Design a protein around this ligand. Structure first.
Ligand SMILES: Cc1cc2nc3c(=O)[nH]c(=O)nc-3n(C[C@H](O)[C@H](O)[C@H](O)COP(=O)(O)OP(=O)(O)OC[C@H]3O[C@@H](n4cnc5c(N)ncnc54)[C@H](O)[C@@H]3O)c2cc1C
Lengths: 662, 14, 132
């Protein structure tokens, strides 16, 4: 809705001021309501102006000229807002044409460790703020966990590949700046069982509904029943799902017991009636004989002999009336027994097939979180849900590497340079690095500040790949330990011809056991060339890294032949298998919220380190060691956009420290 | 994280 | 409130997560009791089958034809003598006495108790009935 849509696209509320804005504009937020609305409009309009054309720099001069009365009345207010938005990277980020070239004299010196999206985004900002920036990258390429396979005409992503909707996504801006061939992914995903036959529509919808019900139940367990600690240990999502499933199996058995208990009570009610009837039939038999004996005493009789005939007649008919009132009650209980035998409860909660299809949905969840469900925090695994972008998910058909390559332009990047040691004191910083091709060749880099974008997997390493001098404080290292770093792998299969449904982007393979549920469970058809991409998720990812490419591709072909036919599936021209946990420069795929951890650990990851004074009694020194990366952004973890935003945050923080605020 | 589910997006517990 | 059709109570959660094998113990305990109840079902089914076999033919050879006749105001000597014996056997059950005589209503029987109280010593007759 114009200016309101600009705030939404920048992840800001249109009608109120944020915590960051309150810090930079305390006079406004504590002041009258009218001035706040003036601030909010200037903010929203400036954002709209940038968002309308993100290919060119938006200056203060261009901003003020396009503002109307009475908003362009206060010129220093407009300047304060513009500077704030520029400094925090909400406007003028990414690849844009600079209207007046950057000042020749550079102020301050920053070393950035790592040339992924977080590193590159921070580097661009710091350079455009007028700082001396050098990036040190261990790999022979930029991009990091954005890694695109390219051989001949085949293009496929081994790392990041999906833009998770454009509504509120900073990657929407980047896509208007860099030629990303964004193609919408169609949601339709048919599942094929181990035999190779598709799951019927009725069963498929039943299992999926039960899956979401099971997930909703674990949330109920967490929030309402407070089932978060068990045996002095934090409860995992996997644990909670087991508990819910077990209680559903219990209810199936409890309702079976209650049903067959209604049968025995009816049978025993019938048993008491049948005994009563057998005893009365014998009394009726005896009294009939007594009647006919008295009746065979032929007339004329005295009145006592007549009474004997008449009284035995009354007594017999009364017992026959009593028998008839039990005979239809027998019928009432036999039909009650008929309907109970015809209407039993459920035999099982889930069959063997139902459990297997459910294990696919669990594997799909294990893909998303890049980790087995027994490692995820029950309370906090989905803490970033409210920050989900709107719109369809999109493939980067051009190959995602086009983004970091474009961000790399005009930057001083030292490739094949592995950081070994980070030194930080009150005077400044030393970064000690080696050449990866020749490890004896040593490099020393001196700087005012260090920005660490090393993956969480690298920071977790014992023994360490990178040493910090002095050692990182306990609050930092404990957060590094608590936090989860997951794993996920991809198998790229390049063919000469399309043998699959071209209008179907996604199809699933249902595994035989729970143990192998994530093993080649999902297939992607996304690219212009005939390429199929298979995922290895959950417990399978770590195990499948110890298996050779030929065997993995063999298992891929066996699954596809089951679905499409042996004659229909040719041998692939090119194959690639990712091994992200084994990769020394990643040591996994992306962060997750582990059991025992929370969203607060992401904030602790983001917090800069301040060294002690050199001389004792010297004033409190400034922060020297800064952190960015997907593992440092609470609201957008484990993504490209989150990495991007973490870089923009840190550049703004470093510039505030070393160039002064505003 | 959960927002990355392109295929069969989970709904339970949001 | 839990999702409709799912069952999760504070008591049931604690029983399943009490120890490492508490879940399998609870589920097997209910499995054994299901076999135990079904065995009892088969037992009573076989008992009832034997009892139903003894009731074959019902009470058909022992049922008597229903004879109905119009009520008469006049008491014959025979009807009076039938009544005195009926009082001796049945007491104050006026319905039973009516069915014995055959042609006297429940109200007419009740009047007989008052009309012939002195002449048929009905007080003495009812005392003989209570004594047994
Ligand atoms: C298989 C997979 C699929 C993914 N899919 C998606 C997706 O669909 N959508 C999405 O949004 N996100 C996805 N991601 C996540 C995304 O790739 C990352 O969150 C993001 O790229 C991380 O950026 P970063 O800069 O924080 O870390 P990185 O990109 O890893 O940057 C860190 C850099 O530091 C370097 N480095 C490591 N050690 C040293 C050293 N000693 N010295 C110097 N340099 C070093 C590394 O080589 C690396 O280049 C996926 C990730 C994986 C693994």
């Amino acid at each position: 809705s114009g200016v309101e849509g600009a705030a939404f696209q920048s992840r800001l509320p249109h009608d109120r001021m944020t915590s960051q804005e309150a810090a930079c504009f305390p006079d406004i937020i504590s002041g009258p309501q009218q001035t706040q609305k003036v601030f909010l409009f200037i903010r929203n309009r400036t954002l709209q102006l940038w968002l309308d054309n993100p290919k060119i720099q938006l200056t203060f001069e261009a901003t003020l000229q396009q503002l109307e009365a009475p908003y362009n009345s206060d010129t220093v207010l407009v300047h304060r807002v513009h500077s704030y938005l520029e400094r925090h990277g909400l406007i003028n980020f990414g690849i844009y044409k600079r209207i007046k070239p950057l000042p020749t004299k550079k102020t301050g010196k920053v070393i950035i460790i790592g040339s992924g999206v977080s590193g590159l985004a921070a580097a661009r900002q710091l350079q455009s703020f007028g700082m001396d920036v050098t990036l040190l990258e261990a790999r022979d390429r930029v991009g990091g966990r954005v890694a695109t396979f390219r051989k001949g005409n085949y293009v496929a992503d081994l790392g990041a590949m999906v833009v998770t909707g454009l509504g509120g996504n900073p990657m929407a801006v980047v896509s208007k700046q860099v030629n990303m061939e964004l193609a919408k992914i169609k949601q339709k995903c048919p599942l094929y069982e181990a035999n190779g036959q598709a799951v019927p529509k009725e069963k498929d919808e039943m299992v999926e509904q039960e899956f979401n019900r099971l997930l909703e139940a674990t949330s109920y367990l967490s929030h309402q029943l407070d089932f978060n600690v068990l045996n002095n240990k934090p409860v995992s999502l996997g644990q909670a799902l087991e508990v819910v499933i077990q209680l559903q199996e219990k209810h199936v058995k409890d309702e079976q017991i209650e049903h067959w208990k209604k049968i025995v009570k009816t049978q025993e009610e019938l048993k008491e009636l049948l005994n009563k009837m057998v005893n009365l039939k014998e009394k009726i038999k005896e009294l009939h004989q007594q009647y006919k004996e008295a009746s065979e005493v032929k007339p004329p009789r005295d009145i006592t002999a007549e009474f004997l005939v008449k009284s035995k007649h009354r007594d017999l008919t009364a017992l026959c009336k009593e028998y008839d009132e039990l005979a239809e009650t027998q019928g009432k209980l036999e039909e009650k027994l008929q309907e109970l035998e015809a209407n039993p409860p459920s035999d099982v909660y889930l069959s063997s097939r139902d459990r297997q299809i459910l294990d696919w949905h669990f594997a799909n969840l294990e893909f998303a979180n890049a980790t087995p469900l027994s490692t995820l925090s029950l309370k906090h695994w989905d803490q970033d849900d409210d920050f989900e972008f709107t719109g369809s998910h999109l493939t980067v058909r051009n190959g995602y590497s086009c983004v970091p390559v474009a961000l790399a332009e005009g930057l001083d990047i030292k490739l094949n340079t592995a950081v070994r040691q980070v030194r930080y004191t009150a005077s400044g910083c030393e970064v000690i690095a080696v050449n990866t091709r020749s490890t004896s060749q040593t490099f020393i880099y001196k700087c005012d500040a260090v920005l660490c974008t090393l993956p969480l997997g690298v920071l977790k390493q014992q023994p360490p790949a990178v040493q910090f001098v002095p050692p990182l404080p306990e609050w930092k290292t404990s957060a590094v330990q608590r936090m989860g770093f997951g794993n996920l792998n991809k198998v790229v299969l390049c063919f000469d011809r399309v043998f699959w449904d071209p209008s179907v982007n996604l199809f699933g393979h249902v595994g035989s056991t729970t143990a192998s549920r994530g093993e080649l469970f999902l297939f992607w058809n996304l690219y212009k060339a005939p390429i199929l991409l298979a995922l290895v998720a959950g417990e399978a990812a770590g195990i499948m890294e110890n298996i050779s490419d030929d065997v993995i591709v063999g298992r891929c072909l066996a699954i596809l032949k089951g679905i499409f036919g042996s004659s229909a599936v040719p041998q692939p021209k090119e194959t690639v298998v990712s091994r992200w946990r084994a990769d020394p420069w990643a040591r996994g795929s992306y962060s997750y919220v582990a059991a025992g951890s929370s969203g607060n650990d992401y904030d602790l990851m983001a917090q800069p380190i301040t060294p002690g004074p050199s001389i004792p009694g010297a004033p409190q020194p400034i922060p020297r060691l800064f952190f960015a990366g997907e593992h440092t952004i609470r609201n957008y973890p484990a993504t490209v956009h989150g990495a991007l935003l973490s870089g923009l945050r840190e550049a703004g923080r470093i510039a505030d420290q070393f160039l002064g605020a505003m | 994280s959960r927002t990355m589910q392109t295929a069969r997006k989970s709904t339970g517990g949001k | 409130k839990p999702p409709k059709g799912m069952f999760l109570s504070q008591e049931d959660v604690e029983a399943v997560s009490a120890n490492a094998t508490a879940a399998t113990t609870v589920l097997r305990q209910l499995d054994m009791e299901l076999v135990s109840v079904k065995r009892q079902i088969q037992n009573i089914k076989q008992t009832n089958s034997a009892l139903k076999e003894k009731l074959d033919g019902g009470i058909e050879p022992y049922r008597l034809p229903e004879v109905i006749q119009k009520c008469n105001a006049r008491w014959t000597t025979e009807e009076q003598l039938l009544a005195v014996q009926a009082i001796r056997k049945y007491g104050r059950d006026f319905q039973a006495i009516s069915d014995v005589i055959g042609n006297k209503s429940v109200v007419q029987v009740k009047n007989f108790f008052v009309n012939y109280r002195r002449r048929f010593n009905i007080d003495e007759v009812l005392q003989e009935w209570e004594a047994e």
